[PDB]
Amino acid sequence: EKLFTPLKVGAVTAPNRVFMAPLTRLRSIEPGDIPTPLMGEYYRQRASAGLIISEATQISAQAKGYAGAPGLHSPEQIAAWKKITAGVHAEDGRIAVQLWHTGRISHSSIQPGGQAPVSASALNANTRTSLRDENGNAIRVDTTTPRALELDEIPGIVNDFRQAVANAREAGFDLVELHSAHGYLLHQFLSPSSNQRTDQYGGSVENRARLVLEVVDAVCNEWSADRIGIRVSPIGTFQNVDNGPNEEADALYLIEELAKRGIAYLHMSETDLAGGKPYSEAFRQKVRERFHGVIIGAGAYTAEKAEDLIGKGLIDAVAFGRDYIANPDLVARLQKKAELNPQRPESFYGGGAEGYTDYPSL
Ligand SMILES: Cc1cc2nc3c(=O)[nH]c(=O)nc-3n(C[C@H](O)[C@H](O)[C@H](O)COP(=O)(O)O)c2cc1C
Ligand SMILES: O=[N+]([O-])c1ccc(O)c([N+](=O)[O-])c1
């Protein structure tokens, strides 16, 4: 067994390779998109994880796409996150903040001024996002057609990512994870299906990856490369966003470029919740030889699969999502081969303590 052995991850050292995947739970306070004491307790309960990767968090107000998702751009948000990271550290844990801009997977009612959300192009995501009703309960609503970002608006987006990372550092996070997957803003530019731009930010893979790489360079300069991680979902289709007709080649190009920056880790989301074709070992080898930092695998993983791939030297750690929702002490359970608590999907989004902090530890 190797899942329970130490691993150097950028600036910190994880005591095991069982990581907690980023999980949107939509329980933040509105107005303000402020993290809560309840959220602090939830993360504290899971502090034994090799590394906790937080729920997706807004780099700006414009970045918001879901009612209940937290931000890391205001003083109130920074103060609240400081208490949460302190709780995790009090229990000897490590926590990274996943930073995102939802782009077109949003709704005008939660955008600044109630205006249309932004994206690489003016194409509707054709999916749904989560808002809140008059009683504060989570509700699904069709996404609003976006406005294409103007060329001179791009530097502002890069700067928002830069500022958010500076804020993350002050908030006490150990690392930051750029959300460059699942059809959100960065992925919207990466994919030909959602990017029909004719300027230097669309067309060739070099142009499509231009934005995410400018962001990576900006955050490495703001803090340090060994504090930066990135999540990608380059193979298959995720929330209606595929990766084009040359996904494998384009993925390898992006990974080689990321490697040049010497960042802390590469987090690969292998499949959408609805499923997808499995990664071939040949592809895993091509990825492995192109990146020199930690590689995290994710997507319906079993402990057995994690051990198999870590033993073959193809990945270094595994991020579990739904199992972590239902098992705060997942590490101890997997180590002892104990049974897990059953999942209650109806409380994954919104609500309060029920289905959030009420899953017991052994
Ligand atoms: C309730 C819920 C919320 C999620 N929110 C996030 C998130 O904020 N960011 C992210 O990158 N993926 C998110 N995911 C995907 C998970 O990180 C993970 O990749 C996925 O659940 C597959 O892993 P699993 O089979 O171990 O759960 C979410 C999934 C679920 C079920
Ligand atoms: O539904 N969600 O709130 C949500 C948020 C971010 C994500 O990255 C995902 N996803 O791709 O699994 C889902």
DSSP states of 119-151: ESSS----SEEEEE-TTS-EEEEEPPPPEEPPG
**Quick check: is 184 catalytic?**
yes
3-state DSSP call for residue 223? coil
Q: Provide the 8-state DSSP code for 262.
A: T
**Chain centroid offset of residue 260 CA:** 21
320 lines ligand 1 (CB under 6 A): yes
Q: For residue 296, give the ligand nearest its CA.
A: 1
Which strand (E) or helix (H) includes residue 228?
strand 228-232
Experimental approach was X-ray
User: Which phi and psi angles does 118 have, rounded to 5°?
Assistant: -110, 160
Q: Provide the 8-state DSSP code for 346.
A: G
239 lines ligand 2 (CB under 6 A): yes
Q: What homologous superfamily does CATH list for 1-362?
A: Aldolase class I (3.20.20.70)
187 lines ligand 1 (CB under 6 A): no
β-bridge partners, 7: 14
3-state DSSP call for residue 229? strand
Closest-CA residue, ligand 1 atom 4, reads: 23
Q: With beta carbons less than 8 A apart as the criterion, state whether 169 and 131 touch.
A: no
Q: With beta carbons less than 8 A apart as the criterion, state whether 101 and 157 touch.
A: yes
Q: Is 10 exposed, middle or buried (0-12, 13-18, 19+ CB in 10 A)?
A: buried
Q: For residue 23, give the ligand nearest its CA.
A: 1
Closest ligand 1 atom number to CA of residue 56: 8
Pairing of strands 18-20, 317-320: parallel
Pairing of strands 147-148, 118-119: parallel
231 lines ligand 1 (CB under 6 A): yes
Closest-CA residue, ligand 2 atom 11, reads: 182
Q: Provide the 8-state DSSP code for 99.
A: E
Closest-CA residue, ligand 1 atom 2, reads: 23
